[PDB]
Design a binder for these strands. Structure first.
Ligand SMILES: [K+]
Ligand SMILES: [Mg+2]
Length: 222
RNA sequence: CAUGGUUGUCGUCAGCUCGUGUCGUGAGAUGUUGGGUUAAGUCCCGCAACGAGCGCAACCCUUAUUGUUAGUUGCCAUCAUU
């Protein structure tokens, strides 16, 4: 990845100066027009390190979970996770998604069952109300758990966009001692993330750029 | 005022709870709250909650329309007689 690519994607932008986090001074370059500017030099070095780290995880046969519910990041992470073959959560991170993974597997099994009914033809012989109601249930299960329906075990690594937004996901990862690779913004906390990627979380182009790099790292590892 | 069984009562009011998860040193909390909606914890939406159970509802009986099968001890329009 290139510094010009980062700048074009707008990675450098941060949030308001008043809303920053002191720990981010380690990565902040300068403030312009009242908003902080991430140090793209450290960003390039750290994204390369994260690329290498994700590559190692992939080569180990590990499972990756891409997390982002930001309006900007939701669609981008879905596409890249699908492309990489690893699983994703993009609409809403359900509390206990991993700490209560055992419970969530029951809903995933329920989702698998409702899919089989369509293929089998139960829906055809199902009463109007039944099929309609079951279709609505299937829609909710897909909308929430769709991106992780086939995740075999607890992810070996969790990539996150804007942990400050994805507070709950970070907490579950810590509880399960799962490494976190996050797009950290000027108002976030870097201590919570093992592999920090100082970047703007509020730029769709930047999110696509960084997320695609991570997905390519996993693909290369495989 | 040792009990089983049976019953009244709030009240057919919409509540009462648990599993896992999470928060809290702890009793506890969350879900069950909140925006709507309903007769209803009824349902949708959002939510560190995700589900489930007892309730609610539905399945049951009766009443209100009707087809078909049946046509006597019931009914009498078409017919004649009493
Ligand atoms: K509990
Ligand atoms: Mg109920």
């Amino acid at each position: 990845i290139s510094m010009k690519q980062l700048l074009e994607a707008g990675v450098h932008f941060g949030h308001q100066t008043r809303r920053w986090n002191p720990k981010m001074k380690k990565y902040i370059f300068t403030e312009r027009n009242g908003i902080y500017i991430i140090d793209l030099q450290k960003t390039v070095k750290l994204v390369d390190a994260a690329y290498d780290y994700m590559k190692n995880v992939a080569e180990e046969g590990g499972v990756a979970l891409f997390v982002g519910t930001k309006k900007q990041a939701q669609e981008a992470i879905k596409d890249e996770a699908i492309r990489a073959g690893q699983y994703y959560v993009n609409h809403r991170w359900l509390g206990g998604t991993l700490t209560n993974w055992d419970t969530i597997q029951k809903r995933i099994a329920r989702l698998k069952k409702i899919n089989a009914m369509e293929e089998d033809g139960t829906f055809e012989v199902l009463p109007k109300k039944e099929v309609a109601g079951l279709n609505k249930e299937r829609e909710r299960l897909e909308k929430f758990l769709g991106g992780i329906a086939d995740m075999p075990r607890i992810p070996d690594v969790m990539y996150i966009v804007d942990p400050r937004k994805e507070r709950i996901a970070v907490q579950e990862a810590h509880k399960l001692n799962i490494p976190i690779v996050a797009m950290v913004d000027t108002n976030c906390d870097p201590d919570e993330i093992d592999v920090v990627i100082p970047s703007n979380d509020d730029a769709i182009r930047a999110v696509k750029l960084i997320t695609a790099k991570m997905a390519d790292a996993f693909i290369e590892g495989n």
